[PDB]
Amino acid sequence: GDWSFLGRLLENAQEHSTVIGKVWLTVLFIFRILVLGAAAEEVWGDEQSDFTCNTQQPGCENVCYDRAFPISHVRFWVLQIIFVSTPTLIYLGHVLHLVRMEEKRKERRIAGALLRTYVFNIIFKTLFEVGFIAGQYFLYGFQLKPLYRCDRWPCPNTVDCFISRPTEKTIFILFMLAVACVSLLLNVLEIYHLGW
Amino acid sequence: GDWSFLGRLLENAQEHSTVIGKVWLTVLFIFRILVLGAAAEEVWGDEQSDFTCNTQQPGCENVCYDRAFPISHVRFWVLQIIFVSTPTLIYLGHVLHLVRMEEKRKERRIAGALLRTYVFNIIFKTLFEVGFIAGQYFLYGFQLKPLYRCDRWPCPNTVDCFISRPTEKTIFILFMLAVACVSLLLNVLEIYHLGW
Structure with missing residues (x-):
């Protein structure tokens, strides 16, 4: 997974963001993307290869893994990261658009419509x-x-199947939940600092 | 398979039987019982152990062998031998009963009722x-x-299963059919010699 391009765009957003927003982005980079790539991906690497069922029935392990894990937690976290990043990119695009329009007008920050878009970004991020x-x-x-x-x-009938690394996976599930909740708190603080 | 007792009773029947009947009994002993014990039983020995199906499904080979071979040919031939012998034993029992009754009357062959039973024996054997x-x-x-x-x-779906020794088994199937038909011809000759 190469997050280079998203990182490069979100650092631009960091240049135009509030201090709490900068904290949020740092949390995204260090506690979600970095953990996902350095720790979690490995934990889930053998999710199906080490998934075992007590059966001689061909195909049972495949269908049972699929039913137990319709989508791997790591894929879900990747999607979550991308969607919670998307509004930031929208706001940054509006910023760059207004800057280019200003340069054009010259040829021939957070207030106004840009503040409305910022606050909508915080709202969609939260949701x-x-x-x-x-x-x-x-x-x-x-x-x-x-x-x-x-x-x-x-x-x-009913077959007993056994998960790979249930406890480590639970640890990282709870870690990612805590990180997401911290992100929500930061968003709420952004909207209370802007309100005040 | 120990055929000693049936043999001992059928040799008694040989003492009280017609010449064609003696031929029939000799055919029974040599071409059915002896072949079954010396040749066929061995041929069918590995009927299920060497029966193979192209599948990874547990239980399929069991059900497929059972469907292909609801009763092994050798078991069927054993039953056939016993049933075609049974009327002979009935006739021999009637013989011994009349002899014992004669001995009793003295104290205090094929005609009459004994000939009627003989001919009924030949009829049931044929059927x-x-x-x-x-x-x-x-x-x-x-x-x-x-x-x-x-x-x-x-x-x-449909599975391909392979029989053990199909050709040898076919040879012995046809051999036993021929022996049975020879037995039928002998019965018919008994009833035509008695008629004449």
Whole structure:
């Protein structure tokens, strides 16, 4: 995963952002992207190769892994990172557009319409963070148990399947939840600093 | 398989039987019982152990062998031998009963009621031989093909299964059919010699 281009754009957003916004971006880079690439990806590397079911039925392990893990937590976190970054890019684009328009007018910061877009950016960021949190909760909860009981065809009756690294995965699930909640708190602080 | 007791009783029947009947009993001993024990049993020994199906499905080979071979030819031939022998034992029992009654009357061959029972013995023998022949035909035919196609659950879709020793088994199927037909001819000759 090469996050270079998103990083380069979000550092530009850092130049035009509030101090709390700069904190939020630093959290995104260090506690989400960096952890994901240095720690979590490895943890989940053997998610299917080390997933085992007590059965001689061909195809059962495939369908049972798929049912247990419709989307890997790491993929979900990648999507979450991209969506919570997107409004920042929208605001930065509006910034660059107004700067280029100003340069043109000359040939021939946060107030006004730019402040309205900034605050909308903070709102959409908040809603997307909340949505991904709640989706993670309703899909997986905040804990991975070692045992998964599977009755999906072709599996005969109910089969016992065993997860790879349930405890380490639970640790990182809770870590990422905490980081997301810290991000929400930062957004709320941005909207209370702007309000005040 | 210990045929000693049936043999001992059928040799008694040989003492009280017609010459053609003696031929029939000799055919039974030499061309059915002896072949079954010296040749066929061995041929069919690995009927299930060498039966193979192209599948990874647990249980498929079991159900496919069972469907292909609801009853092994050798078991069928054992039953046939016993049933075609049974009327002979009935006639011999009537003989011994009349002899013991004669000894009693003294204290205090084929005509009459004994001839009626003899001819009924020949009739039931014929009907049982015919019935087993026709049953063998409708169950298996007179040939075993190497390939058996099986769609019985749990087998997925249609599976290719392969028989042990199809050609040797076909040879012995046809041999036993020929021996049974010779027995029928002998019965018919008994009833035409008695008629004449």
